[PDB]
Design an enzyme around this catalytic site. Structure first.
Site, short mmCIF file in Angstrom:
data_model
loop_
_atom_site.label_atom_id
_atom_site.label_comp_id
_atom_site.label_asym_id
_atom_site.label_seq_id
_atom_site.Cartn_x
_atom_site.Cartn_y
_atom_site.Cartn_z
N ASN A 80 -21.81 13.99 26.83
CA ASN A 80 -23.21 13.64 26.93
C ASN A 80 -23.69 12.64 25.89
O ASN A 80 -23.15 12.54 24.77
CB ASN A 80 -24.03 14.92 26.85
N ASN A 124 -20.78 23.92 24.04
CA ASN A 124 -21.08 22.67 23.30
C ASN A 124 -20.37 22.46 21.97
O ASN A 124 -20.47 23.30 21.06
CB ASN A 124 -22.60 22.69 23.13
N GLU A 159 -22.79 25.85 35.95
CA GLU A 159 -22.33 25.02 34.83
C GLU A 159 -21.09 24.21 35.18
O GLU A 159 -21.00 23.02 34.85
CB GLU A 159 -22.08 25.89 33.58
N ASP A 176 -19.41 19.20 26.45
CA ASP A 176 -19.43 20.55 27.00
C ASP A 176 -18.08 20.85 27.64
O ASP A 176 -17.59 20.05 28.46
CB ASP A 176 -20.49 20.63 28.09
N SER A 205 -23.55 16.13 22.52
CA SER A 205 -22.79 17.29 22.98
C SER A 205 -21.61 16.86 23.86
O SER A 205 -21.74 15.92 24.69
CB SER A 205 -23.68 18.29 23.71
N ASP A 262 -26.35 12.86 24.24
CA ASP A 262 -27.13 13.53 23.19
C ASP A 262 -26.19 14.01 22.09
O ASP A 262 -26.62 14.69 21.14
CB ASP A 262 -27.97 14.64 23.81
CL LIG Z 1 -25.41 24.79 21.89
#
Ligand SMILES: [Cl-]
Ligand SMILES: [Cl-]
Ligand SMILES: [Cl-]
Ligand SMILES: [Cl-]
Ligand code: NA
EC number: 3.2.1.17
Length: 129
Positions: A46, A59, A35, A52, A50, A48
């Site tokens: 991201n 997230n 990760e 991170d 998120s 989308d």
């Molecule tokens: Cl999540």
């Protein structure tokens, strides 16, 4: 902070992840390697929705607050900045919340796609914790 494999394994053990919810320690070390490359300040923003954060790339859509996304949740009840600290305690506490929420380590894409089914115990080889 950039951790070494065994250094992170020691900290994770101290914070009680060995066998937590059925996941032997190497699972958590392997997930962090893929990760974040063991970097406490890893941050990936991201498309989308998120963002991170930290060594376990947790997230913001669900688990921490960074202020940017009013439709999101904060189920670990923490600022996302807590996940970017040099000590791992907030990342471990929130990871524990994610897994115990009727869930598993499938919550980490890199666990599912790089660690599940492998010899995860070998991530603790030569650590002699
Ligand atoms: Cl999540
Ligand atoms: Cl490594
Ligand atoms: Cl268990
Ligand atoms: Cl927010
Ligand atoms: Na959030």
């Amino acid at each position: 902070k950039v951790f070494g494999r065994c250094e992170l394994a020691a900290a994770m053990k101290r914070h009680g992840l060995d066998n937590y919810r059925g996941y032997s320690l190497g699972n958590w070390v392997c997930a962090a390697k893929f990760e974040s490359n063991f970097n406490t300040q890893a941050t990936n923003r991201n498309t989308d929705g998120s963002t991170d954060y930290g060594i376990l790339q947790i997230n913001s859509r669900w688990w921490c607050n960074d202020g940017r996304t009013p439709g999101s949740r904060n189920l670990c009840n923490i600022p996302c900045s807590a996940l970017l600290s040099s000590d791992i305690t907030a990342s471990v506490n929130c990871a524990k919340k994610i897994v115990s929420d009727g869930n598993g380590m499938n919550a980490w894409v890199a666990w599912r796609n790089r660690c599940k089914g492998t010899d995860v115990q070998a991530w603790i080889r030569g650590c002699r914790l």
